[PDB]
Design a protein around this ligand. Structure first.
Ligand code: PRO
Ligand code: PRO
Ligand code: NA
Ligand code: NA
Lengths: 516, 516
């Protein structure tokens, strides 16, 4: 099967009147459908429950954006039975056939781009460009994994020949597994975590994050329209731990793909290491568990370029990203000039309802608001608050861009992941000290350096211990194919999304010899 | 660096007078050197202890082959410090430099080959050809991994370009880890499990199996002469679980490479899943945990050819192989002709001191004798003893080749790994039933089919769920490079040894973008 070489889906900037009109049409369509109820999707059919879950607009939380069915253990067991039944034949599809199905799903998703973007705007508080980036990344995962799976097709393995025998090694998929998806990229990461395993012949039960169940259901409408056979993909919105715990601990769950907090990721990895009664394999658990990502700037940098990249990295999607710059490490020569520029830029950021395309929407929920404001209270005790640090007026969960300065490297706000619009600025003497401070966290996801000094950049290339490092640009928005995405240390298992190596995680290898 | 394409090291059959002359001298010299003492090897030096461990000759256990120092937690901690210190610089060696070091080690091992084979004969009771296959396999791991490692060299990752930027993804080693090696291939598997991680820039602390400490020490004389820098490889023989437990559970152990019993493998995997106090990463654990491997024969097979392969597979090295045929699954039309031929061949097998080059030597220890004899007693209930089932006369741990017939598929002897010369014969109707019985164990390591029917062979290729499958040939003796070795289910994590994929398990990936 031959398609165009992979290109990333263009992220809409909405600079043309047509693009803006198309977005306004989509927003209107989406809000007109706020009354909709979305069931579970199990074994090729939409399956409703008596209990329901409600999704709220975090920019106006008295407004409901939709409701969904709510799965429990029994629905979890039913999806597991459907997923294994499906696996029996889905594993046997030619890779070309599986990859074409993915390419169909991508095309369907591309045609519904604005609708999904508008759903992100209303359901999770993404501004328009954050929304467009999220949907473009989802399309990219589908496009990329569809192609990358072909690189593993029967029989892919390079082996040494032997006289008088055929020796053939090849990959096969693992089985049925569970995906536990985050709310912050509930199209992109939700989609990538499902379609990667699915591309190469696995089957998946997906649990969306509670805050993003409506957009996950809309992704499943796309899967259903594309024609995935019954049981290949399954959708189980649920409240709290019930569904996730039941499946993670199940003797018949083959693998777990998780993106979310370190707290939950640790529990998952530990549970995966245990043999449940009657289990007959060693579970694979892939976890991406957040970061405490720093940007270093030294005295040689373009200070204006740095301040722009820092503000984008710190406050894009309200800093609710595993890749967000939450630390700003400035050498002595860079300290005042860069801090001054960041403050002047950050003070001009708009905050408001996401549908108006502000620089910042609200944080995602009342619980998130609580967590972020709690950390602000801690930061006031630990460093010097110099911008923001408060809730803004409106029912929506609006928090001001916040900056603490003179923060000790080992302070709680310089160590713990806040996941909100809070930047901690750490002053150091020189680049050596900057690198020490950068590395001295439990995390290792993203990181950045602004500097013109080649020796410093190349030193960072070798020694700034993060899985995704960026020089003289923002540290967020890793593109599928371009920047394999995944971290070190307590940022997770280094399962690199948007890379050829990702699909290998969902395969095992068989070696078959025939002596003639 | 450019070397000849990989070829497997030829396995000596000792058919020429030249080869027998050389082997007789090597065995005489090793026998003459019984009682030698070998210290620990930590941080580039031999380090002795007050306590010592004794390695006996299983063919004559009143004879001490040699003694070694005995490591405790203190020595384990010293080796860990030495390994991390070494890693700081070993990680930065050009890959060509690391690979040349491995090629030197291989050359030295090749030059000491008859001595190493003789040491196996005496220390673990391998006959001459089993000893030569084992040493040849070790040389192959070194040669193979030295070349495979170059395929990962900076910057190896295929990425999609982006305008105005360099995007560079590359692999880095993980750090210091522990190798826990088996007694049954204590040159081959010991060597491969250590040099694989080491080749790509990791550092290793290696715990040999207690029954094979002397030959492990001679491998370390080779590492030393080759000139691995201090701390890069460390040798810690020890008694019972203290050393392995201390390292497996240590917050500063990065990875665990284990080959051995399922019982121990399960505990290791569970422990690796936990975050020890102060730990700052998710541990990787690679485990290969044995098999209950079957050969199926249908009525279309060459019955003479099948009987030969079955007897080699079941009784080679006294059946003490994770790859050994311990089940013989025969369709109704194959049953009588194949069993007759197996019995006639098996009854002709010699059993005696390994130095004599018998068909079978002793089992490895008093504990193994006890375990295998205990399983024979179990089998006498569950099946019908038709051959052997007894300890033979002598101080050595001699056990007769044993056959049980009419064994129920779910019998303990048809499900549990005995790791001795004990074959369970299972009657089935046809090839479909043969596959069902083959698959219905907790394991999935090796398997074989003797059949001339193309449709049966290709059906098995798809459905006989083992990681190493062989048609019309023995199911043991997987060759490095030719047959990537590793299983499914409770045979372990499918870390395929002797394959390009193995080295990827000891690396993580960094993605570094520069915007110009
Ligand atoms: O790097 C980022 O910001 C997004 C989130 C996961 C990967 N792409
Ligand atoms: O297949 C075999 O018999 C040995 C065991 C480990 C791989 N080579
Ligand atoms: Na919501
Ligand atoms: Na011994």
């Amino acid at each position: 099967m031959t398609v165009e070489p992979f290109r990333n889906e263009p992220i809409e900037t909405f600079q043309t009147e047509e693009a803006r009109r198309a977005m306004r049409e989509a927003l209107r369509r989406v809000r007109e459908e706020f009354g909709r109820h979305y069931p579970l999707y199990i074994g090729g059919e939409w399956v409703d429950t008596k209990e329901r879950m409600v999704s709220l607009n975090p920019s106006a939380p008295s407004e409901v954006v939709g409701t969904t069915a709510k799965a429990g253990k029994a629905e979890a067991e039913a999806a597991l039975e459907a997923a294994w039944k499906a696996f029996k034949t889905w594993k046997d599809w030619p890779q070309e056939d599986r990859s074409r199905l993915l390419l169909k799903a991508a095309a369907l998703m591309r045609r519904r781009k604005r609708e999904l973007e508008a759903t992100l705007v209303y359901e999770v508080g993404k501004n328009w460009v954050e929304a467009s980036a999220d949907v473009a990344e989802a399309i990219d995962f589908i496009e990329y994994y569809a192609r990358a799976a072909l690189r593993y097709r029967y029989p892919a393995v390079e082996v040494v020949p032997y006289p008088g025998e055929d020796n053939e090694s090849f990959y096969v998929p693992l089985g049925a597994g569970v995906v536990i998806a985050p709310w912050n990229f509930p199209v992109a990461i939700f989609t990538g975590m499902i379609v990667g395993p699915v591309a190469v012949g696995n089957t998946v039960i997906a649990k969306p994050a509670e805050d993003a169940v409506v957009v996950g259901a809309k992704v499943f409408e796309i899967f259903h329209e594309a024609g995935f056979p019954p049981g290949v993909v399954n959708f189980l919105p649920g409240v709290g731990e019930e569904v996730g715990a039941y499946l993670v601990e199940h003797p018949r769950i083959r693998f777990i793909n998780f993106t979310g907090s370190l707290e939950v990721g640790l529990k998952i990895y530990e549970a995966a290491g245990r043999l449940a009664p009657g289990q007959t394999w060693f579970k694979r658990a892939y976890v991406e568990t957040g970061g405490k990502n720093a940007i270093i700037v030294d005295e040689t940098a373009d200070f204006d370029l740095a301040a722009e990249g820092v503000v984008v990295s710190a406050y894009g999607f309200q800093g609710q990203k595993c890749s967000a710059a939450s630390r700003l490490i400035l050498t002595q020569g860079a300290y005042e000039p860069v801090l001054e520029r960041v403050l002047k830029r950050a003070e001009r950021l708009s905050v408001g309802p996401a549908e108006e395309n502000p620089d910042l929407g609200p944080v995602v929920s009342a619980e998130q608001e609580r967590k972020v404001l709690s950390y602000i209270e801690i930061g006031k005790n630990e460093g010097q608050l110099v911008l923001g640090g408060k809730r803004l007026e409106g029912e929506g969960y609006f928090i001001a861009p916040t900056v603490f300065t003179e923060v000790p490297p080992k302070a709680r706000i310089a160590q713990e992941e806040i996941f909100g619009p809070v930047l901690s600025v750490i002053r150091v003497k020189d680049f050596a000290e900057a690198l020490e401070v950068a590395n001295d966290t439990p995390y290792g996801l993203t990181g950045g350096v602004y500097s013109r000094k080649r020796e410093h950049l190349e030193w960072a290339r070798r020694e700034f211990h993060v899985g995704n490092l960026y020089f003289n640009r923002k540290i967020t928005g890793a593109l599928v194919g371009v920047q394999p995405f995944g971290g070190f240390k307590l940022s997770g298992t280094n399962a690199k999304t948007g890379a050829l190596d990702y699909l290998r995680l969902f395969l095992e290898m068989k070696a078959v010899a025939e002596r003639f």
